[PDB]
Amino acid sequence: GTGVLTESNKKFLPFQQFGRDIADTTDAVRDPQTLEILDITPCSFGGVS
Amino acid sequence: TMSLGAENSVAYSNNSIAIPTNFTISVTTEILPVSMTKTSVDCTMYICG
Ligand SMILES: *[C@@H]1O[C@H](CO)[C@@H](O[C@@H]2O[C@H](CO)[C@@H](O)[C@H](O)[C@H]2NC(C)=O)[C@H](O)[C@H]1NC(C)=O
Ligand SMILES: *[C@@H]1O[C@H](CO)[C@@H](O[C@@H]2O[C@H](CO)[C@@H](O)[C@H](O)[C@H]2NC(C)=O)[C@H](O)[C@H]1NC(C)=O
Ligand SMILES: *[C@@H]1O[C@H](CO)[C@@H](O)[C@H](O)[C@H]1NC(C)=O
Ligand SMILES: *[C@@H]1O[C@H](CO)[C@@H](O)[C@H](O)[C@H]1NC(C)=O
């Protein structure tokens, strides 16, 4: 996926792996190493007039 | 069964009239929507990811 990775304060339960938004797309994910918790947010975008 | 309205009967006769002797200044409200929230969508960002 493409996005920005930022530090997250979400308290995952030890067994929990993903984090899903309303649209069932991975919002918060756990990296295989360091067992860290991140946020996945789409890059800056918008309309042009 | 819903009460259709308060029952009433006005005394009608062909030589009698009723004329007010006092008045009452009344204020009433009325709410009307004018414009909703302007919205816009992005085609590819929604259909695709
Ligand atoms: C003016 O007089 C008429 C009759 O004298 C009144 O009409 C009657 O009003 C009473 C009120 O309790 C009713 O019970 C009667 O049935 C009415 N008469 C008829 C024939 O229906 C009238 O109400 C009077 N005006 C006012 C403002 O009270
Ligand atoms: C018309 O109605 C008004 C209000 O319903 C009357 O004014 C009232 O008069 C009494 C006695 O003079 C006072 O105690 C109230 O405080 C008044 N009310 C208000 C809101 O000022 C008035 O008297 C009526 N008209 C007539 C000719 O009696
Ligand atoms: C891989 O990362 C884990 C998490 O810190 C660490 O304990 C381990 O030593 C690392 N192993 C290698 C080969 O880098
Ligand atoms: C009013 O109607 C009655 C019948 O209900 C009638 O007798 C009377 O003449 C009428 N009034 C007038 C002024 O004609």
SSE order of chain A, as H and E? Answer: EEE
Distinct small-molecule ligands in the complex = a molecule of 2 linked components (NAG-NAG), 2-acetamido-2-deoxy-beta-D-glucopyranose
> Gyration radius of chain A, to the nearest Å?
13 Å
What is the molecular shape of chain A? elongated
* Strand fraction of chain A: 15-25%
For the terminal residues of chain A, how far apart are their CA atoms?
28 Å
Please state how the strands of the largest beta sheet of chain A are arranged side by side.
1-3-2
Structural class of chain A: mainly beta
Oligomer: part of a larger assembly
Give the % helix of chain A: under 10%
List how many beta strands of chain A DSSP finds. 3
Main sheet of chain A, how many strands, which sense, barrel? 3 strands, antiparallel
Tally of DSSP helical segments of chain A: 0
Largest interface, with counts of residues having CB < 8 Å to the other chain, equals: A-B, 3 and 4 residues
Organism (chain A): Severe acute respiratory syndrome coronavirus 2
Protein name (chain A): Spike protein S1
Task: Explain what this protein looks like in three dimensions.
This is part of a larger assembly, with two copies of chain A (49 residues). Chain A has 49 residues and is an all-beta fold. Chain A has strands at residues 4-7, 28-30, 37-41. A three-stranded antiparallel beta sheet of chain A has the order 1-3-2, with no helix packed on it. In chain A, strand 2 and strand 3 form a beta hairpin. The radius of gyration of chain A is 13 Å and the shape is elongated. The complex binds a molecule of 2 linked components (NAG-NAG) (2 copies) and 2-acetamido-2-deoxy-beta-D-glucopyranose (NAG) (2 copies). Residues 33-34 of chain A line the site of one 2-acetamido-2-deoxy-beta-D-glucopyranose.
